[PDB]
Coordinates of C-alpha atoms and ligand atoms in Angstrom, one line a residue:
Chain A
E26 CA 63.5 90.0 100.4
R27 CA 64.1 91.6 97.0
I28 CA 67.4 93.3 96.0
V29 CA 66.1 96.5 94.4
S30 CA 69.6 98.0 94.0
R31 CA 73.1 96.5 94.1
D32 CA 74.7 99.9 95.1
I33 CA 72.8 103.1 95.7
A34 CA 76.2 104.8 95.7
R35 CA 77.1 103.6 92.1
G36 CA 80.6 102.8 93.1
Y37 CA 81.4 106.0 95.0
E38 CA 82.0 104.3 98.3
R39 CA 84.6 101.8 99.1
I40 CA 81.9 99.1 99.4
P41 CA 78.6 98.8 97.7
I42 CA 75.5 99.9 99.6
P43 CA 72.6 97.6 98.4
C44 CA 68.9 98.5 98.7
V45 CA 66.6 95.6 99.7
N46 CA 62.9 95.5 100.3
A47 CA 61.1 92.7 102.2
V48 CA 58.1 94.7 103.2
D49 CA 56.2 96.1 100.2
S50 CA 56.5 96.8 96.5
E51 CA 58.3 100.2 96.7
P52 CA 61.3 100.3 94.4
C53 CA 64.7 101.8 95.3
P54 CA 64.3 105.6 96.2
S55 CA 65.3 107.7 93.2
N56 CA 64.0 111.2 93.9
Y57 CA 67.5 112.5 94.9
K58 CA 71.0 112.4 93.6
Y59 CA 73.5 110.2 95.6
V60 CA 76.7 112.2 96.4
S61 CA 79.5 110.8 98.5
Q62 CA 80.8 114.3 99.5
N63 CA 79.1 117.6 100.4
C64 CA 78.1 119.9 97.6
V65 CA 76.9 123.4 97.0
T66 CA 74.3 125.0 94.9
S67 CA 74.5 128.8 95.6
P68 CA 78.2 129.7 96.7
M69 CA 79.4 129.1 100.2
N70 CA 82.5 131.2 100.9
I71 CA 84.4 128.5 102.9
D72 CA 87.9 129.8 103.9
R73 CA 90.2 127.6 101.9
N74 CA 93.4 129.8 102.2
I75 CA 96.0 127.1 102.9
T76 CA 98.0 129.6 105.1
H77 CA 94.9 129.8 107.5
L78 CA 95.3 126.2 108.5
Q79 CA 96.7 125.3 111.9
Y80 CA 98.8 122.2 111.6
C81 CA 101.3 120.0 113.4
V82 CA 105.0 119.5 113.0
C83 CA 105.2 115.9 114.2
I84 CA 108.0 113.6 113.1
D85 CA 106.2 110.5 114.5
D86 CA 102.7 109.1 113.8
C87 CA 100.9 111.9 115.7
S88 CA 100.5 109.8 118.8
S89 CA 102.1 112.3 121.2
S90 CA 100.6 115.2 123.3
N91 CA 102.9 117.5 121.3
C92 CA 100.7 117.2 118.1
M93 CA 99.0 120.6 117.6
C94 CA 96.1 118.8 115.8
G95 CA 95.5 116.7 118.9
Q96 CA 95.7 119.8 121.1
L97 CA 93.1 121.6 119.0
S98 CA 90.9 118.5 119.6
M99 CA 91.9 118.7 123.4
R100 CA 93.6 115.4 122.7
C101 CA 93.7 113.0 119.8
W102 CA 90.6 110.8 120.5
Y103 CA 91.7 108.1 118.1
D104 CA 93.2 104.7 119.0
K105 CA 95.5 102.9 116.5
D106 CA 92.4 101.3 114.8
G107 CA 90.7 104.7 114.3
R108 CA 88.2 104.1 117.1
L109 CA 87.3 106.8 119.7
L110 CA 88.9 106.3 123.1
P111 CA 86.7 105.1 126.1
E112 CA 87.1 108.6 127.7
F113 CA 85.4 110.3 124.7
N114 CA 82.4 112.2 125.8
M115 CA 79.5 110.8 123.8
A116 CA 77.0 112.9 125.7
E117 CA 78.7 116.2 124.9
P118 CA 81.3 115.6 122.1
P119 CA 84.3 117.9 121.4
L120 CA 85.3 119.2 118.0
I121 CA 87.8 116.8 116.3
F122 CA 90.6 118.4 114.3
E123 CA 92.1 115.8 112.0
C124 CA 95.5 116.3 110.5
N125 CA 95.7 117.9 107.1
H126 CA 97.8 118.6 104.1
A127 CA 99.6 121.6 105.8
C128 CA 100.8 119.2 108.5
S129 CA 104.4 117.7 108.5
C130 CA 103.1 114.2 109.2
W131 CA 102.4 111.3 106.8
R132 CA 99.0 110.5 105.3
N133 CA 98.8 107.4 107.5
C134 CA 99.2 109.2 110.8
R135 CA 97.0 108.3 113.9
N136 CA 94.9 111.5 113.6
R137 CA 93.1 110.6 110.3
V138 CA 89.8 108.7 110.3
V139 CA 86.9 110.6 108.9
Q140 CA 89.0 111.8 105.9
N141 CA 89.4 108.1 105.0
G142 CA 85.7 107.9 104.4
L143 CA 83.0 105.3 104.9
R144 CA 84.1 101.6 105.6
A145 CA 81.3 99.7 107.2
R146 CA 79.1 97.4 105.1
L147 CA 75.7 99.1 105.3
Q148 CA 72.4 98.5 103.6
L149 CA 69.3 100.5 102.7
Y150 CA 66.2 98.6 103.6
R151 CA 62.4 99.0 103.9
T152 CA 61.2 99.1 107.6
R153 CA 57.8 98.0 108.7
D154 CA 57.0 101.4 110.2
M155 CA 59.2 104.3 109.3
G156 CA 59.8 104.1 105.5
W157 CA 63.4 103.3 104.5
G158 CA 66.1 102.8 107.1
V159 CA 69.8 101.8 107.2
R160 CA 71.3 98.9 108.9
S161 CA 74.8 97.5 109.4
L162 CA 75.5 94.2 107.8
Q163 CA 78.4 93.5 110.2
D164 CA 79.3 94.1 113.9
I165 CA 80.6 97.6 114.5
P166 CA 82.6 98.1 117.7
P167 CA 82.1 101.1 120.0
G168 CA 83.6 104.4 118.9
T169 CA 83.8 103.5 115.1
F170 CA 83.3 106.0 112.4
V171 CA 80.2 104.8 110.5
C172 CA 79.2 107.5 108.0
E173 CA 79.2 111.2 107.3
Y174 CA 76.0 113.3 107.1
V175 CA 76.4 114.4 103.5
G176 CA 74.4 116.8 101.4
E177 CA 73.9 120.2 100.1
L178 CA 75.5 123.0 102.2
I179 CA 72.9 125.9 102.5
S180 CA 72.3 129.0 104.7
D181 CA 69.5 129.0 107.3
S182 CA 67.7 131.7 105.2
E183 CA 67.7 129.2 102.3
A184 CA 66.6 126.4 104.5
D185 CA 63.6 128.4 105.9
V186 CA 62.2 128.8 102.3
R187 CA 62.4 125.1 101.5
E188 CA 59.2 123.1 101.4
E189 CA 60.7 119.8 102.7
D190 CA 62.5 120.1 106.1
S191 CA 62.9 116.3 106.9
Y192 CA 66.5 116.0 105.6
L193 CA 68.0 119.1 107.3
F194 CA 71.0 118.9 109.7
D195 CA 71.8 122.2 111.4
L196 CA 75.5 123.0 111.6
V203 CA 73.9 129.6 110.8
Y204 CA 74.3 126.9 108.1
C205 CA 72.6 123.6 107.3
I206 CA 73.2 120.4 105.3
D207 CA 70.1 119.6 103.3
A208 CA 70.1 116.0 102.2
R209 CA 66.7 116.2 100.2
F210 CA 68.0 116.7 96.7
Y211 CA 71.6 115.6 97.2
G212 CA 72.8 113.3 100.0
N213 CA 74.5 110.1 100.8
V214 CA 73.3 107.0 102.8
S215 CA 72.8 109.1 106.0
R216 CA 69.7 110.8 104.6
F217 CA 67.9 107.5 105.3
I218 CA 69.0 107.0 108.9
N219 CA 65.9 107.0 111.2
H220 CA 65.5 108.8 114.6
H221 CA 66.1 106.8 117.7
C222 CA 65.7 108.0 121.3
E223 CA 68.5 105.7 122.6
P224 CA 70.8 106.1 119.5
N225 CA 73.6 103.7 118.5
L226 CA 75.1 106.7 116.6
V227 CA 76.2 110.1 117.8
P228 CA 77.1 113.1 115.4
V229 CA 80.5 114.6 115.9
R230 CA 81.7 117.9 114.4
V231 CA 84.9 117.4 112.4
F232 CA 87.4 119.6 110.6
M233 CA 89.8 118.2 108.0
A234 CA 90.9 120.0 104.8
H235 CA 89.7 123.4 106.1
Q236 CA 89.1 124.9 109.5
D237 CA 86.4 127.3 108.7
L238 CA 84.4 127.0 112.0
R239 CA 81.1 127.9 110.3
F240 CA 81.3 124.6 108.4
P241 CA 81.9 121.5 110.5
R242 CA 81.5 118.1 108.8
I243 CA 79.1 115.9 110.6
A244 CA 80.5 112.4 111.3
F245 CA 78.5 109.6 113.0
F246 CA 80.3 107.4 115.4
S247 CA 78.9 104.2 117.1
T248 CA 78.0 104.8 120.7
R249 CA 78.2 101.1 121.5
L250 CA 78.6 97.7 119.9
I251 CA 76.2 97.6 116.9
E252 CA 75.4 94.0 116.1
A253 CA 75.1 92.8 112.5
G254 CA 71.5 93.3 111.2
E255 CA 70.8 96.2 113.6
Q256 CA 69.2 99.4 112.4
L257 CA 71.3 102.6 112.6
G258 CA 69.7 105.5 114.4
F259 CA 70.7 108.9 115.8
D260 CA 68.9 111.5 117.9
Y261 CA 67.3 114.1 115.6
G262 CA 67.2 116.5 118.6
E263 CA 64.6 118.8 120.1
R264 CA 64.1 121.4 117.3
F265 CA 63.0 118.5 114.9
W266 CA 60.4 117.1 117.3
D267 CA 59.0 120.5 118.4
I268 CA 57.6 120.6 114.8
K269 CA 57.3 116.9 113.8
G270 CA 55.4 116.0 117.0
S274 CA 54.9 110.6 116.9
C275 CA 58.1 108.7 117.4
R276 CA 58.0 105.0 116.5
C277 CA 61.6 104.1 117.7
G278 CA 60.0 101.6 120.1
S279 CA 62.4 102.5 122.9
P280 CA 61.3 101.7 126.5
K281 CA 62.9 105.1 127.2
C282 CA 61.3 106.8 124.1
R283 CA 61.0 110.6 124.7
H284 CA 58.6 111.4 121.7
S285 CA 55.8 108.7 121.4
Chain B
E26 CA 123.5 107.0 94.8
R27 CA 122.2 108.1 98.2
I28 CA 118.4 107.7 98.9
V29 CA 117.5 111.0 100.6
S30 CA 113.8 110.3 100.9
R31 CA 111.5 107.2 100.9
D32 CA 108.7 109.4 99.6
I33 CA 108.6 113.1 99.1
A34 CA 104.8 112.9 99.0
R35 CA 104.6 111.5 102.6
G36 CA 102.1 108.9 101.6
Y37 CA 99.7 111.3 99.8
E38 CA 100.1 109.6 96.4
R39 CA 99.0 106.0 95.5
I40 CA 102.7 105.4 94.9
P41 CA 105.8 106.7 96.8
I42 CA 108.1 109.2 95.0
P43 CA 111.6 108.6 96.4
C44 CA 114.4 111.2 96.1
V45 CA 117.9 110.0 95.3
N46 CA 121.2 112.0 94.8
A47 CA 124.1 110.3 93.1
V48 CA 125.7 113.6 91.9
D49 CA 126.3 115.8 95.0
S50 CA 125.7 116.4 98.8
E51 CA 122.4 118.3 98.4
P52 CA 119.7 116.9 100.8
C53 CA 116.1 116.3 99.7
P54 CA 114.5 119.7 98.6
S55 CA 112.5 121.1 101.5
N56 CA 112.1 124.8 100.6
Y57 CA 108.5 124.1 99.4
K58 CA 105.4 122.3 100.8
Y59 CA 104.5 119.1 98.9
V60 CA 100.7 119.1 98.2
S61 CA 99.1 116.4 96.1
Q62 CA 96.2 118.6 95.0
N63 CA 95.9 122.3 94.0
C64 CA 95.4 124.9 96.8
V65 CA 94.8 128.6 97.0
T66 CA 95.9 131.4 99.3
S67 CA 93.9 134.4 98.1
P68 CA 90.3 133.2 97.3
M69 CA 89.5 131.8 93.8
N70 CA 85.8 131.9 93.1
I71 CA 85.7 128.6 91.3
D72 CA 82.1 127.9 90.1
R73 CA 81.2 124.8 92.2
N74 CA 77.4 125.0 91.9
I75 CA 76.4 121.3 91.2
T76 CA 73.5 122.4 88.9
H77 CA 76.1 124.1 86.6
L78 CA 77.6 120.8 85.7
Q79 CA 77.1 119.2 82.2
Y80 CA 76.9 115.5 82.8
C81 CA 75.9 112.2 81.0
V82 CA 73.0 109.9 81.3
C83 CA 74.9 106.8 80.2
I84 CA 73.5 103.3 81.0
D85 CA 76.8 101.5 80.3
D86 CA 80.5 102.2 81.2
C87 CA 80.6 105.4 79.0
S88 CA 82.3 103.5 76.1
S89 CA 79.6 104.3 73.6
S90 CA 79.4 107.0 70.9
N91 CA 76.6 108.6 72.9
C92 CA 78.4 109.6 76.1
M93 CA 77.6 113.3 76.6
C94 CA 80.9 113.9 78.5
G95 CA 82.8 112.3 75.6
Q96 CA 80.9 114.8 73.3
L97 CA 82.2 117.7 75.3
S98 CA 85.7 116.4 74.8
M99 CA 84.9 116.0 71.0
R100 CA 84.9 112.2 71.8
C101 CA 86.2 110.2 74.8
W102 CA 89.9 109.9 74.2
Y103 CA 90.5 107.0 76.6
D104 CA 90.7 103.3 75.7
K105 CA 90.0 100.4 78.0
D106 CA 93.4 100.9 79.8
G107 CA 93.0 104.7 80.4
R108 CA 95.4 105.6 77.5
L109 CA 94.8 108.3 74.9
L110 CA 93.6 107.0 71.6
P111 CA 96.2 106.8 68.8
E112 CA 94.1 109.5 67.1
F113 CA 94.7 112.0 69.9
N114 CA 96.3 115.1 68.5
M115 CA 99.4 115.7 70.8
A116 CA 100.3 118.8 68.8
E117 CA 97.0 120.4 69.5
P118 CA 95.2 118.6 72.4
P119 CA 91.4 119.1 72.9
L120 CA 89.9 120.0 76.3
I121 CA 89.0 116.8 78.2
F122 CA 85.8 116.6 80.3
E123 CA 85.9 113.6 82.5
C124 CA 82.8 112.2 84.1
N125 CA 81.8 113.7 87.4
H126 CA 79.6 113.1 90.4
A127 CA 76.5 114.6 88.5
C128 CA 76.7 111.9 85.8
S129 CA 74.3 108.9 85.9
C130 CA 77.2 106.5 85.3
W131 CA 79.3 104.6 87.8
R132 CA 82.6 105.7 89.4
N133 CA 84.5 102.9 87.5
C134 CA 83.4 104.2 84.0
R135 CA 85.8 104.5 81.1
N136 CA 85.9 108.4 81.1
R137 CA 87.8 108.7 84.4
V138 CA 91.6 108.7 84.4
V139 CA 93.1 112.0 85.8
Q140 CA 90.6 111.9 88.7
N141 CA 92.0 108.5 89.7
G142 CA 95.5 110.0 90.4
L143 CA 99.2 109.4 89.8
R144 CA 99.9 105.7 89.2
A145 CA 103.3 105.6 87.4
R146 CA 106.5 104.9 89.4
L147 CA 108.4 108.2 89.5
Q148 CA 111.6 109.4 91.2
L149 CA 113.2 112.7 92.1
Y150 CA 116.9 112.5 91.3
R151 CA 119.8 114.9 91.1
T152 CA 120.8 115.7 87.6
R153 CA 124.4 116.5 86.6
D154 CA 123.6 119.8 84.8
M155 CA 120.0 120.9 85.5
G156 CA 119.6 120.3 89.3
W157 CA 116.7 117.9 90.3
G158 CA 114.7 116.2 87.6
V159 CA 112.1 113.5 87.6
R160 CA 112.5 110.1 86.0
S161 CA 110.3 107.2 85.4
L162 CA 111.3 104.0 87.1
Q163 CA 109.2 101.9 84.7
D164 CA 108.2 101.8 81.0
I165 CA 105.3 104.1 80.4
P166 CA 103.3 103.3 77.2
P167 CA 102.3 106.3 74.9
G168 CA 99.2 108.2 75.9
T169 CA 99.4 107.3 79.6
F170 CA 98.5 109.8 82.4
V171 CA 101.8 110.5 84.2
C172 CA 101.2 113.3 86.7
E173 CA 99.2 116.6 87.1
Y174 CA 100.9 120.0 87.3
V175 CA 99.9 121.0 90.9
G176 CA 100.5 124.1 93.0
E177 CA 98.9 127.4 94.1
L178 CA 96.2 128.7 91.9
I179 CA 96.8 132.5 91.6
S180 CA 95.7 135.4 89.3
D181 CA 97.9 136.7 86.4
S182 CA 98.3 140.0 88.5
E183 CA 99.6 138.0 91.5
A184 CA 102.0 136.0 89.3
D185 CA 103.3 139.4 87.8
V186 CA 104.3 140.7 91.3
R187 CA 106.2 137.6 92.4
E188 CA 110.0 137.3 92.3
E189 CA 110.1 133.6 91.4
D190 CA 108.6 133.0 88.0
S191 CA 110.4 129.6 87.3
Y192 CA 107.5 127.4 88.6
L193 CA 104.6 129.1 86.9
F194 CA 102.1 127.3 84.6
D195 CA 99.9 129.6 82.6
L196 CA 96.2 128.4 82.3
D197 CA 94.4 130.5 79.5
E202 CA 90.8 137.0 83.5
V203 CA 94.0 134.8 83.3
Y204 CA 95.2 132.4 86.1
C205 CA 98.3 130.5 86.8
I206 CA 99.5 127.6 88.9
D207 CA 102.5 128.7 90.9
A208 CA 104.4 125.6 92.2
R209 CA 107.1 127.6 93.9
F210 CA 105.7 127.5 97.5
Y211 CA 103.2 124.6 97.2
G212 CA 103.5 122.0 94.6
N213 CA 103.8 118.3 93.7
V214 CA 106.3 116.1 91.8
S215 CA 105.7 118.2 88.5
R216 CA 107.4 121.3 89.9
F217 CA 110.7 119.3 89.4
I218 CA 110.1 118.4 85.7
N219 CA 112.8 120.0 83.5
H220 CA 112.1 121.5 80.1
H221 CA 112.7 119.5 76.9
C222 CA 112.5 120.6 73.3
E223 CA 111.3 117.2 72.2
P224 CA 109.2 116.4 75.3
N225 CA 108.0 112.9 76.3
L226 CA 105.1 114.7 78.1
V227 CA 102.3 117.0 76.9
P228 CA 100.0 119.0 79.1
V229 CA 96.3 118.5 78.6
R230 CA 93.6 120.8 80.0
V231 CA 91.2 118.6 81.9
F232 CA 87.9 119.1 83.8
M233 CA 86.6 116.9 86.5
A234 CA 84.7 117.9 89.6
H235 CA 83.9 121.4 88.2
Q236 CA 83.6 122.8 84.7
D237 CA 84.7 126.4 85.4
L238 CA 86.6 127.1 82.2
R239 CA 88.9 129.7 83.9
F240 CA 90.4 126.9 85.9
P241 CA 91.5 123.9 83.8
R242 CA 93.6 121.3 85.5
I243 CA 96.9 120.5 83.9
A244 CA 97.5 116.8 83.2
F245 CA 100.7 115.4 81.7
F246 CA 100.3 112.5 79.3
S247 CA 103.1 110.6 77.7
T248 CA 103.8 111.5 74.0
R249 CA 105.5 108.1 73.2
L250 CA 106.9 105.1 75.1
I251 CA 109.0 106.4 78.0
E252 CA 111.5 103.8 79.1
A253 CA 112.6 102.9 82.6
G254 CA 115.1 105.5 83.8
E255 CA 114.1 108.2 81.4
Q256 CA 113.9 111.7 82.7
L257 CA 110.5 113.4 82.2
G258 CA 110.4 116.6 80.2
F259 CA 107.7 118.9 79.0
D260 CA 107.9 122.0 76.7
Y261 CA 107.8 125.1 79.0
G262 CA 106.9 127.1 75.9
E263 CA 108.1 130.3 74.3
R264 CA 106.8 132.8 76.9
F265 CA 109.2 131.1 79.4
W266 CA 112.3 131.2 77.1
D267 CA 111.5 134.8 75.8
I268 CA 112.1 135.8 79.5
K269 CA 114.8 133.3 80.5
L272 CA 119.9 134.7 81.2
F273 CA 120.7 131.1 80.3
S274 CA 120.3 128.7 77.4
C275 CA 118.5 125.4 77.1
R276 CA 120.5 122.4 78.2
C277 CA 117.9 119.6 77.2
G278 CA 120.6 118.2 74.8
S279 CA 118.2 117.5 71.9
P280 CA 119.7 117.4 68.4
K281 CA 116.6 119.6 67.6
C282 CA 116.8 121.9 70.6
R283 CA 115.1 125.2 69.8
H284 CA 116.4 127.3 72.7
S285 CA 120.1 126.5 72.7
Ligands
LIG1 N1 61.7 107.4 115.0 C1 60.9 107.6 114.0 N2 59.5 107.3 114.1 C2 58.6 107.6 113.1 N3 59.1 108.1 111.9 C3 60.4 108.4 111.7 C4 61.3 108.1 112.8 N4 62.5 108.5 112.4 C5 62.4 108.9 111.1 N5 61.1 108.9 110.7 C6 60.6 109.3 109.4 O1 61.6 109.6 108.4 C7 61.9 111.0 108.3 C8 63.4 111.3 108.4 S1 64.4 111.0 107.0 C9 64.8 109.2 107.4 C10 64.5 108.2 106.3 C11 63.0 107.9 106.0 N6 62.5 106.7 106.8 C12 62.7 107.7 104.5 O2 62.0 106.8 104.1 O3 63.1 108.5 103.7 C13 61.0 111.6 109.3 O4 60.5 112.9 108.9 C14 59.9 110.6 109.6 O5 58.9 110.7 108.5
LIG2 N1 116.2 122.6 79.5 C1 116.7 123.3 80.5 N2 117.9 124.0 80.3 C2 118.4 124.7 81.4 N3 117.8 124.8 82.6 C3 116.6 124.2 82.8 C4 116.1 123.4 81.8 N4 114.9 122.9 82.3 C5 114.8 123.3 83.6 N5 115.8 124.1 83.9 C6 116.0 124.8 85.3 O1 115.0 124.5 86.2 C7 114.1 125.6 86.3 C8 112.6 125.1 86.2 S1 111.9 124.2 87.6 C9 112.5 122.6 87.2 C10 113.1 121.9 88.4 C11 114.6 122.4 88.7 N6 115.6 121.6 87.9 C12 114.9 122.4 90.2 O2 116.0 121.9 90.6 O3 114.2 122.9 91.1 C13 114.5 126.6 85.2 O4 114.2 127.9 85.4 C14 116.0 126.3 85.1 O5 116.6 126.9 86.2
LIG3 ZN1 100.7 115.6 114.6
LIG4 ZN1 99.2 113.8 111.7
LIG5 ZN1 98.5 117.4 112.2
LIG6 ZN1 61.6 107.3 120.4
LIG7 ZN1 78.8 108.8 79.9
LIG8 ZN1 80.9 108.1 82.9
LIG9 ZN1 79.7 111.6 82.3
LIG10 ZN1 116.4 122.3 74.3

């Protein structure tokens, strides 16, 4: 198992994200630019007017049903360790509105998780069957924020005239992780996924532009490959799945 | 000396900024919203196209003569400790272009200081004569990044129509940072005719030249307890009713 990179993120994450290869002689992928945060090429007129934010007036740690930001989210879904509550609907997730800089609360309040960024020790690695994949180097408990789907924010019109469509996440707007992305660009499709994407609003609340946060759907054991469900639009064009699920819907 | 706030920044800075009042019964200022980064109300079309960034191809920690981002800045002005080189012209500062996310270098490279944020221990306190000032609670060596002037980025024509002009920083199509309604610790810094702070125009995540960010660097050793001051400049005093109270033997606006 060769270490082909000590950190594909080049110090932009809280931890390094190594790339190893125990399978063949492919070096670390280098046909893209690692970015830890979403970027644009042509302008995207995101509403950043600070007076447009809805915000809370809490004097505590935003753990009460009075928090506006929790109400926008239906309730605050976060426990004190930043994990999704057991009652969180993994099959049909709500929008999460995290607290923001217009709010009266402190930066350490309960309702702040995704804005704190990636924490789990993850690793790019060569799979036997589906190119590069990502795995966790540690146990991740259920409902943990794992990573954000980061890339280039583009319009659907711009997406349609792109040659490569394998790194597209639909938000109509898209995140294309082909030329610019983070570690998420490498996560493989799985039919019984250990990650679910959740739409999240933080510094802005322009509803055209959710941020896409992956949360664990169960305990993810150390060494295990990360996967999420690419959804039906992807397979309608890309259809065989090699996830190896007894319940695989696309093989 | 009453402590009237643990931290006026509510945990948004690396360090807390307490407020104390040992002069009167004024409570902690609360007629403004503290923000640790610049904001807008009306849209500012900042060029944020990632392909418009100039960037470097450095294979080291950007400490060599060859750093392209250093070249944009004339040279990189930071030493190993993030302090401005002794050769830095405080009387006529260059534009600084810090490394960005488009550079080939690592996030811990030498050419990254302002983007790392406020680090010095500061305090909002009640002055006897000039209401609310900011002091340092530690010695700050010369050429250290102290704080950024943050507030609401607005056009010159929006600044013209506002009643409160006392928290305006002019940038250089002209734009201003208005810290009246939304600002950080810097909005509380008093004017001084021999200032221990100098504003430097800095570029980080974008290089849209209409929108520099304003970083205050120390002009000399500031000692523990010393009030911060910068020179508001002549435009300000040409308008401003009252005379300067900075108390400098060389005051120019007395
Ligand atoms: N479950 C699966 N079965 C077979 N191939 C898959 C797969 N999930 C992802 N892939 C492959 O990976 C692409 C998605 S991008 C994911 C990272 C990719 N393995 C890489 O090396 O860059 C798909 O278009 C497909 O080629
Ligand atoms: N050197 C100086 N002499 C007299 N007044 C000053 C001064 N420097 C700052 N001020 C006062 O502070 C204003 C700038 S904003 C600085 C913070 C201010 N002391 C506050 O309590 O909010 C000026 O318009 C003036 O009212
Ligand atoms: Zn709240
Ligand atoms: Zn909160
Ligand atoms: Zn809130
Ligand atoms: Zn499958
Ligand atoms: Zn460099
Ligand atoms: Zn650099
Ligand atoms: Zn650079
Ligand atoms: Zn003076």
